[PDB]
């Protein structure tokens, strides 16, 4: 019932869900790499390219999940301090050092981009009550104080052909794809 207890419960669940999502998505990414190799072996260059573009985004998303997990752990260890935060001014001026400002803003901003972890929405609800609605809207609508790294991993730019080629070459090494098959995809 108490705010501190509801927050602790929320953060713990977010950590478990984020860890599980990482595990699952990493395993799937591995399968995707095998499938790209199979596309290369069968001369399906166009499809292999499309699959790599998706894989690139999948890997970036996994990195996002890893960072969010760390932010959750940070907040979990400082839960008692967050209990003494009632305004955004306090958050930005008194909690920029302990990394709380950055951590909470990043998790709220991530809700829209990580629907696989529903509990993140609970953090928004909790902070909208603890601080105010203005704070949460500033994060979502205007990404105020949200780290550039988080904004980029939530919305990565188009993969350049150089990176796609690099992925193809690394997948070819992993799966011993014949030279001719990989070259035809570059």
UniProtKB/Swiss-Prot annotation:
GO terms for cellular component: cytoplasm; endosome. Its main location: cytoplasm. One of its GO terms (biological process) is late endosome to vacuole transport via multivesicular body sorting pathway. The keyword Cytoplasm applies. The keyword Zinc does not apply. GO terms for molecular function: ATPase inhibitor activity. It comes from the Eukaryota. Keywords: Cytoplasm, Endosome, Protein transport, Transport. It is found in: Cytoplasm; Endosome. Belongs to the IST1 family. Present with 4760 molecules/cell in log phase SD medium. Interacts with DID2. Interacts with VPS4 (via MIT domain); the interaction prevents VPS4 oligomerization, competes with the binding of VTA1 to VSP4 and diminishes the ATPase activity of VSP4. Involved in a late step in sorting of cargo proteins of the multivesicular body (MVB) for incorporation into intralumenal vesicles. The lumenal sequestrated membrane proteins are targeted into the vacuole after fusion of the endosome with the vacuole. Regulates the recruitment of VPS4 to the ESCRT-III complex, probably in conjunction with DID2, and VPS4 catalyzes the disassembly of the ESCRT-III complex. This is Vacuolar protein sorting-associated protein IST1. It comes from Saccharomyces cerevisiae (strain ATCC 204508 / S288c). The lineage of its organism: Eukaryota, Fungi, Dikarya, Ascomycota, Saccharomycotina. The gene is IST1. The chain holds residues 6 to 191 of 298 of the full protein.
């Amino acid at each position: 019932i108490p705010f501190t207890i509801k927050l602790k419960t929320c953060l713990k669940m977010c950590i478990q869900r984020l860890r599980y999502a990482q595990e699952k998505q990493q395993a799937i990414a591995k399968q995707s790499r095998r499938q790209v190799a199979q596309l290369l072996l069968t001369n399906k260059e166009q499809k292999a390219h499309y699959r790599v573009e998706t894989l690139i985004h999948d890997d970036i998303h996994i990195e996002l999940l890893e960072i969010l997990e760390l932010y959750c752990e940070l907040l979990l260890a400082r839960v008692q301090v967050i209990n003494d935060i009632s305004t955004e001014e306090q958050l930005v001026k008194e909690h920029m050092d302990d990394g709380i400002n950055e951590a909470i803003r990043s998790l709220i901003y991530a809700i829209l981009f990580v629907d696989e972890v529903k509990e993140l929405s609970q953090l928004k609800d909790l902070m909208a009550w603890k601080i105010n609605v203005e704070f949460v809207n500033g994060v979502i609508a205007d990404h105020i104080d949200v780290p550039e790294k988080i904004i980029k991993k939530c919305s990565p730019s188009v993969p350049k052909e150089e990176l796609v080629d690099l992925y193809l070459k690394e997948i070819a090494k992993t799966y011993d794809v014949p030279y001719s098959k990989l070259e035809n995809s570059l």
